[PDB]
Structure 1
Amino acid sequence: PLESQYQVGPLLGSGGFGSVYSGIRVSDNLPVAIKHVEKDRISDWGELPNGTRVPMEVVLLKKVSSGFSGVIRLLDWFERPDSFVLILERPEPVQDLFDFITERGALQEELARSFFWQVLEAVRHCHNCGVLHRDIKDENILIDLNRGELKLIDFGSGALLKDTVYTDFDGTRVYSPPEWIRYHRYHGRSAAVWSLGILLYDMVCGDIPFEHDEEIIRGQVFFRQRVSSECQHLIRWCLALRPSDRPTFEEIQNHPWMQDVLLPQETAEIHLH
């Protein structure tokens, strides 16, 4: 079933998420990514409309799949005795945002705006579909280098979106908000906005602003690179200590720094090609 339909390529990476391989769908040569996750390492389980026990990640990916290219599409999945296998679409050529920022250092604001805007559209789409990612970061964003389009990946820490408090968290700590650090409590939207503030800082400064818990709790932002006052303001707003002081997604996208975003293709022509 898996063997015949897909031709396995090299390992693309591995970690807390499992092991992901390059691959090709044999029927039409479609480029794909093949993610293997061991069952013992899955603590968050969900159920399909069919009534079948699967990893929450599969539920979340099905809920966000559509023609919209801002989220990585789940093409298929398979259960094995001790693992699940996910077949994901794979852009070609591609580079993840962490590697891209490592190579370039701090991104020009025009590029950061285009990239951040697309992440915002992608995250809004997830929320609109009832899905909370809970691990927004550069390592979980792929750049389609030809078209200049970003894609969200890895819903392995995600959850169904809800309006009540979350008391579990399995995402990346240095992107997690002060209310999680201090109280082990957060709400979905406002926690996401905090991670977006960390991400934007990372884009325009070349690295994340906080390393230790005490830095997260103090929430004092120091700019290590030249960043415009408008961008600094948006960053500090997203990183407001009190969750209710953070901007809504609407307020982020209406912020003056976010005006006149480049289209993805224009972004590729100017900054990537």
Structure 2
Amino acid sequence: MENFQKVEKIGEGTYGVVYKARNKLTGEVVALKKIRLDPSTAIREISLLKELNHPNIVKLLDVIHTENKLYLVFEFLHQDLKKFMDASALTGIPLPLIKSYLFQLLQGLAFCHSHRVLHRDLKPQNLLINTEGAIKLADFGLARAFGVPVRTYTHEVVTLWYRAPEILLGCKYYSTAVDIWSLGCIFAEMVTRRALFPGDSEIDQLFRIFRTLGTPDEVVWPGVTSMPDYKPSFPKWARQDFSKVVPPLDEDGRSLLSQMLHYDPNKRISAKAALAHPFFQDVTKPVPHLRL
């Protein structure tokens, strides 16, 4: 920190400690992420992300590779959606605000996907909110750089709750569709105030999906039975109506959610097409109640 002043340790992140800090030259308050090493290719990849700028993407201010350490410097936001939902539990987040947040998140996805950048590990903790009604995606493009570990550097199990079924079934080829799946899971959790698929192992995650959406088959997902971790012995569950899964979401929202949670990644709606869905015909940008 020949260039910053640690305000505090904030948090123990996926990849290393996160600090609130102050840039010595500019006086700006930033999030500093240390990336723990247990790689020249990661550096070039991560550096390109300094150009991937959008109002709904947390700004990557610098990639500092000095003293054989890697620090990522981000624009600082005061709250994340995991804390906001926890704090909103008694009441729920109001539907206009859910709608605004989903709309903004799809804008961010659409931007990144247009530039052929995926997230691959979306979750409420990496969706950051401000006092102005904005929401932004944190940590985009990182996974194609460091992977997604089973455990953090402090042994915090990395959540499986938002992971797409093709990843659980052992598919190595990611597509943009993995991010639409995770955002649909998040959209259902905002509405019902409960995680959709809170698995605690790969098979629990996969079977929670199957009990709600039905066990996938070659009719709904051509190719599924040839995926690496598919087993013909998987129990055969029937598919639940979305009316039972996410009440009191309206028919437009239920239709859009169903499109975001299609099994076949090639059937799943794109972010660009989701922005044109009738669920957004009355979208607005409310001011949230944030206590900081």
Could you tell me the TM-score, scaled by structure 1's length?
0.80
Structure 1 residue 98: deviation in Å?
0.5
Give the letter for the 2:272 counterpart. Answer: E
- Report what 1:31 is aligned to: 29
Contact 1:217/1:241 (CA < 8 Å) preserved in 2?
A: no
- Report what 2:83 is aligned to: 99
Structure 1 residue 184: deviation in Å?
2.6
Give the letter for the 1:237 counterpart. Answer: Q
Structure 2 gap ranges (5+):
150-157, 199-204, 214-241
- Report what 1:119 is aligned to: 105
Q: Which has the higher helix share?
A: 1
Give the letter for the 1:204 counterpart. Answer: V
- Report what 2:225 is aligned to: none
- Report what 2:201 is aligned to: none
Q: Please state if 1:243 is matched with 2:260.
A: no
Map of 1:94-243 to 2, 5 A cutoff?
94-105=78-89, 106-145=92-131, 147-155=132-140, 157-159=142-144, 172-211=159-198, 212-220=205-213, 222-223=244-245, 225-243=247-265
CA distance in 2, matches of 1:249, 1:133: 13
- Helix, strand or coil: the match of 1:54? helix
- Report what 1:8 is aligned to: 6
Contact 1:63/1:129 (CA < 8 Å) preserved in 2?
A: no
Alignment partner of 2:50 out of 37, 41, 62: 62
| 1:204-235 deviations in Å (ceiling 9; x for gaps) | 11222112321124442552652222212211
- Helix, strand or coil: the match of 2:282? coil
**1:89 and 1:250, CA in 2 relative to 1: closer, same or farther beyond 3 A?**
closer
Structure 1 residue 97: deviation in Å?
0.5
**Count of residues in correspondence between the two structures:** 245
Identity of aligned residues (%): 28
**1:224 and 1:123, CA in 2 relative to 1: closer, same or farther beyond 3 A?**
closer
- Helix, strand or coil: the match of 1:227? coil
**1:73 and 1:137, CA in 2 relative to 1: closer, same or farther beyond 3 A?**
same
RMSD: 2.5
Contact 2:47/2:63 (CA < 8 Å) preserved in 1?
A: no
CA distance in 2, matches of 1:60, 1:219: 39
| 1:42-97 deviations in Å (ceiling 9; x for gaps) | xxx564xxxxx6174x23522413xx321111222322445311111113xx2101
Could you tell me the TM-score, scaled by structure 2's length?
0.75
Q: Which has the higher strand share?
A: 1
| Larger Rg, first or second structure (1 or 2) | 2
CA distance in 1, matches of 2:184, 2:278: 16
